[PDB]
Scaffold this active site. Structure first.
Site, PDB file in Angstrom:
ATOM      1  N   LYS A 114       0.824  -1.197   0.000  1.00  0.00           N
ATOM      2  CA  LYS A 114       0.000   0.000   0.000  1.00  0.00           C
ATOM      3  C   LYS A 114       0.866   1.258   0.000  1.00  0.00           C
ATOM      4  CE  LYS A 114      -4.383  -1.590   1.872  1.00  0.00           C
ATOM      5  NZ  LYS A 114      -4.082  -2.953   2.378  1.00  0.00           N
ATOM      6  N   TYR A 135     -12.215  -2.341  -5.590  1.00  0.00           N
ATOM      7  CA  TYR A 135     -12.899  -2.617  -4.329  1.00  0.00           C
ATOM      8  C   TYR A 135     -14.412  -2.689  -4.547  1.00  0.00           C
ATOM      9  CZ  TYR A 135      -8.752  -2.209  -1.392  1.00  0.00           C
ATOM     10  OH  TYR A 135      -7.537  -2.419  -0.786  1.00  0.00           O
ATOM     11  N   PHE A 141     -16.777   2.252   5.420  1.00  0.00           N
ATOM     12  CA  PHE A 141     -15.365   2.603   5.331  1.00  0.00           C
ATOM     13  C   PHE A 141     -14.896   2.851   3.904  1.00  0.00           C
ATOM     14  CE2 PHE A 141     -15.620  -2.078   5.465  1.00  0.00           C
ATOM     15  CZ  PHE A 141     -15.045  -2.382   4.250  1.00  0.00           C
ATOM     16  N   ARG A 179      -1.448 -15.156   4.255  1.00  0.00           N
ATOM     17  CA  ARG A 179      -2.309 -14.648   5.320  1.00  0.00           C
ATOM     18  C   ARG A 179      -1.621 -14.740   6.677  1.00  0.00           C
ATOM     19  NH1 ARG A 179      -6.668 -11.749   3.465  1.00  0.00           N
ATOM     20  NH2 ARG A 179      -7.822 -12.324   5.362  1.00  0.00           N
ATOM     21  N   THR A 186      -5.456  -8.643  10.740  1.00  0.00           N
ATOM     22  CA  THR A 186      -5.847  -7.530   9.886  1.00  0.00           C
ATOM     23  C   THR A 186      -5.837  -6.184  10.598  1.00  0.00           C
ATOM     24  OG1 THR A 186      -7.621  -6.653   8.499  1.00  0.00           O
ATOM     25  CG2 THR A 186      -8.252  -7.966  10.418  1.00  0.00           C
ATOM     26  N   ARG A 216       2.149  -6.352   9.589  1.00  0.00           N
ATOM     27  CA  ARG A 216       1.292  -5.295  10.120  1.00  0.00           C
ATOM     28  C   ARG A 216       1.926  -4.612  11.322  1.00  0.00           C
ATOM     29  NH1 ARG A 216      -3.818  -5.937   8.053  1.00  0.00           N
ATOM     30  NH2 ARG A 216      -3.742  -7.354   6.260  1.00  0.00           N
ATOM     31  N   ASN A 271      -2.890  -0.614   6.951  1.00  0.00           N
ATOM     32  CA  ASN A 271      -2.244  -1.865   7.320  1.00  0.00           C
ATOM     33  C   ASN A 271      -1.027  -2.193   6.461  1.00  0.00           C
ATOM     34  OD1 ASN A 271      -3.366  -2.654   4.905  1.00  0.00           O
ATOM     35  ND2 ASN A 271      -4.793  -4.141   5.789  1.00  0.00           N
ATOM     36  N   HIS A 292      -1.980  -5.656   1.387  1.00  0.00           N
ATOM     37  CA  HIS A 292      -3.274  -6.229   1.048  1.00  0.00           C
ATOM     38  C   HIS A 292      -3.052  -7.579   0.388  1.00  0.00           C
ATOM     39  CE1 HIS A 292      -6.625  -7.207  -1.631  1.00  0.00           C
ATOM     40  NE2 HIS A 292      -7.409  -6.525  -0.818  1.00  0.00           N
ATOM     41  N   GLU A 342      -8.231 -11.365  -9.062  1.00  0.00           N
ATOM     42  CA  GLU A 342      -7.444 -10.153  -8.905  1.00  0.00           C
ATOM     43  C   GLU A 342      -6.163 -10.203  -9.730  1.00  0.00           C
ATOM     44  OE1 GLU A 342      -8.858  -7.742  -7.641  1.00  0.00           O
ATOM     45  OE2 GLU A 342      -7.211  -6.609  -8.523  1.00  0.00           O
TER      46      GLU A 342
END
Lengths: 249, 201, 61, 163, 213
Positions: free
Chosen positions: B9, B49, B57, B85, B91, B105, B115, B118, B129
């Site tokens: 991000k 998204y 949010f 994960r 998260t 994180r 965070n 993704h 994706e």
């Protein structure tokens, strides 16, 4: 082995032949070569040469290319040339059309410093000085661009790329071990195929370093160190041509 | 051997920690199949998204995701989705620091929405994706190559335009040589087709 | 009848084009197929050219 | 580099002319193959059936010689690539519905735009003498309901210049 | 035979590189109800590198559907958003730079950031005339026909003359604009010029290089 000639190694090996640049300009070069290499999209920008002038502000000329293809039986590089007076800030050298390219070869002389100078020919033809500079650089590059043979190779899609498994040239004193950069890798064209007396080779066999000097263009030097496998080439002095080679030799 | 999608991000790129994240990713057994640095636009992020459409949010999420360039990566491993994960950790960064202090994180995240990474959730979402950001990256030769699914694919999308093209060609009946007919039908398909428009200047 | 003409004129290459278009899963399968056919004829002619050039180079050497 | 074939036109023991034709063996090969096979074995005495003044000179029936269909073969539709725009375009003729073509052939005598895309055109006249022979065959003394009153017959027919 | 024409606004970077736009359409289907009912369709329009301004993309079968007539096509007309630097003129860009007078006469290097992420420094090759221009080949928009060749960037020069000049500055300018050719100069002239140059470029009390306050 090498993929791009250094500026420090070249300036070190060609110092004895008068191919030197000022120390302040050397530091400015060290800082401002990557800046131009990143500003422009180029991936290999080295120092081409240094042309003298009626002032003290010699023209430092650098050359860089993105793609290097094999077109119509010749290895063609989409070169781009830049010039500067000091090693700090570079400007670009736009190519010239054929009419000017023929009207710029008759202007023999030493170039002045301000690149906003107009020469006059014959009606009067007003030619800019940067055009003359580009003409001289193009002529010298056409006549003198020297690299060791087999240093390049052809891949898929016909791009000339460095030979990463190049083991150096045997007999580095013979002119058969050097070639123009625009000769296709498979072709057996070398500097021997040029005029016999044009090129002079002095080879220090103990330290293993060879120097090739152009006599048709007296200010072009090329060095090739075999033990470390590093080759470079510079041009110092103006870009005028030695017409009367037959008498001098 | 599976593969998953993962993007760094803008918060971990503005702080110059992208390269360290890639090195950590590679140190744990992953293999970066393809990477690309890119800046999403508002429309592209909103389409990205799509699942959290009309959520509470969503405004801040889409406003943050288009504040700077991000990195997009495909990571390959036998257990790529679950492993990513686990490595990516919980998260919520505040929960992450308490629960797993040595996780991406905790180390690089700063906020509930920032965070700093993704990842995908399920294989269907991962494949979707990867197709979204890498349209030319090959993969999944089992679900796509399936006689029932393949017949459905040809019938639903390719067949409607092809039947009209083969009819027009049967009407016109060009030269009996292959190449002329092939060029004619290809030009017809590229000329009038349902999804694309016609270009005039 | 006409189906034989259609078959022995297009079907052989069209089947390969369909298999390629369904393996890759593009976004515009019709345009993908058309560009595939153009590249098909182009690659046939260029592979002929490639064989010719290789033979010529060997002979010159 | 195409094939060539010639035949003579005679009305009531009077030689009316001769014509030579080029066959488009590079555009519609199978039609030319059938046409040459029938000009080698056939067309030797088959009358000129239908003659339209500013249209076409038609004919070439085999088993009957007077304009009704023949058994033994049916010819599929090869190609609409040659366009009827100039005189002397040899082609095959069939019923309204395609894939029923027979030995019946026709040579145009004027631009014929409508025929394009309906009839297989696979040949041409070669010179001006043959075209003038057809244009002179138009104005026979008397021809009843689009058929010459005497029998305008192909006396001879042969193939020259190619296998 | 009515059609709905819609502007489609693109930035010069998109047209230079080749975008892939997803546009929304609000299409109306007439029913027995007094008011209509409409739906939003999504259309993918693929603009190729350097398509000429005014290109029409026509979607056939899309448009408001009256009960009896099959709807006519919908037209999208390509137009470019204003750019801070460039304005396209056919196949090549135009950059309008305001130039100082001494940059025109003495000569400097203009700095231009191209649509591609490459910077560009172009020297002034002579005394730039008023209303003259400069051309940098191969630095315009790509050719729609061939995806390799491009136009040529055109710098249109508008000089920025100084607003005030003193009388001593005018004296210096007149001495510069009437200096005799170097083969006609006396020895006094050469000595005076050397003295003035050594005084104007004095390292501590000369004004050849100053720092802005």
């Amino acid at each position: 082995v090498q993929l791009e000639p250094n500026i420090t190694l070249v300036l070190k090996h060609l110092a004895s032949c008068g191919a030197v640049v000022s120390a302040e300009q050397q530091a400015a070069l060290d800082h401002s070569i990557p800046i131009k290499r990143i500003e422009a999209g180029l991936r290999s920008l080295t120092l081409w040469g240094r042309l003298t002038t009626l002032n003290g502000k010699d023209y430092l000329v650098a050359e860089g290319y993105n793609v290097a293809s094999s077109k119509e039986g010749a290895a063609v590089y989409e070169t781009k040339y830049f010039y500067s007076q000091d090693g700090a800030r570079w400007s670009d050298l736009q190519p010239v059309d054929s009419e000017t390219a023929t009207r710029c070869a008759r202007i023999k002389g030493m170039l002045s410093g301000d690149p906003a100078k107009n020469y006059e020919l014959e009606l009067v033809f007003q030619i800019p000085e940067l055009a003359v500079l580009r003409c001289r650089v193009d002529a010298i590059a056409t006549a003198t661009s020297v690299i060791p043979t087999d240093s390049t190779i052809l891949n898929a899609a016909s791009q000339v790329v460095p030979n990463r498994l190049f083991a150096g040239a045997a007999y580095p004193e013979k002119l058969e071990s050097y070639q123009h950069r625009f000769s296709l890798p498979g072709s057996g064209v070398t500097l021997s195929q040029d005029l016999r007396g044009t090129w002079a080779v002095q080879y220090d066999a103990f330290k293993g370093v060879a120097q090739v000097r152009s006599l048709l263009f007296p200010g072009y030097f090329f060095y090739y160190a075999a033990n470390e496998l590093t080759w470079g080439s510079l041009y110092v002095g103006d870009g005028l041509r030695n017409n009367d080679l037959i008498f001098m030799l | 051997l599976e593969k998953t999608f993962a993007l760094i991000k803008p918060d971990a790129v503005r702080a110059g920690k992208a390269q360290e994240i890639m090195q950590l990713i590679e140190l744990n057994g992953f293999t970066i199949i393809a990477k690309q640095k890119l800046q999403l636009t508002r429309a592209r992020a909103e389409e990205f998204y799509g699942e959290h459409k009309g959520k509470e949010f969503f405004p801040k999420l889409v406003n943050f995701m288009t504040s700077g360039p991000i990195w997009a990566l495909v990571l390959a491993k036998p257990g790529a989705i679950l492993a990513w994960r686990a490595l990516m950790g919980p998260t919520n960064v505040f929960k992450a620091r308490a629960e797993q202090p040595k996780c991406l994180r905790a180390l690089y995240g700063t906020d509930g929405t920032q965070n700093a990474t993704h990842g995908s959730d399920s294989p269907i979402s991962a494949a979707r994706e990867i197709k979204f950001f890498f349209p030319t990256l090959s993969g999944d030769p089992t679900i796509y190559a399936e006689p029932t699914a393949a017949a459905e694919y040809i019938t639903k999308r390719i067949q409607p335009a092809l039947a009209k093209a083969l009819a027009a060609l049967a009407r016109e009946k060009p030269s009996a040589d292959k190449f002329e007919a092939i060029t004619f039908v290809a030009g017809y398909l590229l000329q009038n087709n349902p999804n694309k428009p016609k270009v005039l200047m | 009848h006409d189906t034989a003409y259609l078959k022995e004129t297009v079907g052989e290459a069209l089947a390969r084009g369909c298999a390629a278009a369904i393996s890759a899963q593009p976004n515009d399968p019709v345009e993908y197929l058309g560009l595939w056919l153009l590249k098909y004829v182009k690659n046939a002619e260029v592979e002929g050219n490639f064989y010719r050039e290789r033979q010529q180079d060997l002979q010159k050497k | 580099g195409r094939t060539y074939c010639a035949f003579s036109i005679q009305q009531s023991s009077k030689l009316l002319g001769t014509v030579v034709l080029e066959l488009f063996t590079d555009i519609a090969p199978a039609t030319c193959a059938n046409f040459i096979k029938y000009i080698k074995d056939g067309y030797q005495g088959t009358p000129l059936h239908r003659i339209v003044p500013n249209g076409w000179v038609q004919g070439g029936d085999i088993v009957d010689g007077s304009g009704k269909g023949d058994p033994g073969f049916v010819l599929p539709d090869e190609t609409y690539s040659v366009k009827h725009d100039a005189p002397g375009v040899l082609g095959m003729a069939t019923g309204g519905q395609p894939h029923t073509a027979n030995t019946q052939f026709y040579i145009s005598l004027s631009p014929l735009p409508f025929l394009d895309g309906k009839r297989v055109a696979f040949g041409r006249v070669l010179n001006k003498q043959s075209l003038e022979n057809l244009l002179a065959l138009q104005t026979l003394p008397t021809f009843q309901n689009e058929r010459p009153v005497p029998d305008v017959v192909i006396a001879s027919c042969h193939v020259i210049y190619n296998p | 035979g009515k059609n709905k024409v819609y502007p489609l606004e693109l930035t010069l970077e998109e047209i230079f590189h080749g975008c892939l736009k997803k546009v929304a359409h609000k299409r109306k289907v007439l029913l027995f109800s007094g008011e209509y009912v409409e739906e939003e369709r999504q259309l993918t329009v693929d603009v190729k590198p350097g398509l000429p301004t005014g290109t029409r993309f026509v979607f056939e079968g899309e448009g408001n559907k009256t009960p009896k007539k099959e709807p006519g096509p919908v037209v999208f007309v390509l137009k470019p958003k204003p750019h801070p630097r460039f304005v396209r003129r056919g196949s090549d860009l135009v950059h309008k730079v305001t130039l100082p007078l001494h940059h025109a006469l003495i000569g400097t290097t203009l700095d231009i950031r191209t649509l591609d992420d490459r910077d560009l420094k172009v020297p002034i090759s002579d005394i730039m005339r008023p209303g003259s221009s400069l051309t940098v080949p191969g630095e315009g928009m790509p050719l729609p026909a061939t995806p390799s060749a491009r136009g040529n960037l055109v710098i249109e020069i508008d000089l920025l003359f100084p607003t005030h000049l003193t009388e001593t500055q005018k004296m210096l300018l007149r001495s510069a604009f009437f200096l005799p050719p170097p083969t006609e100069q006396n020895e006094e002239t050469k000595k005076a010029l050397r003295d003035y140059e050594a005084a104007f470029k004095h390292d501590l009390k000369g004004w050849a290089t100053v720092f802005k306050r």
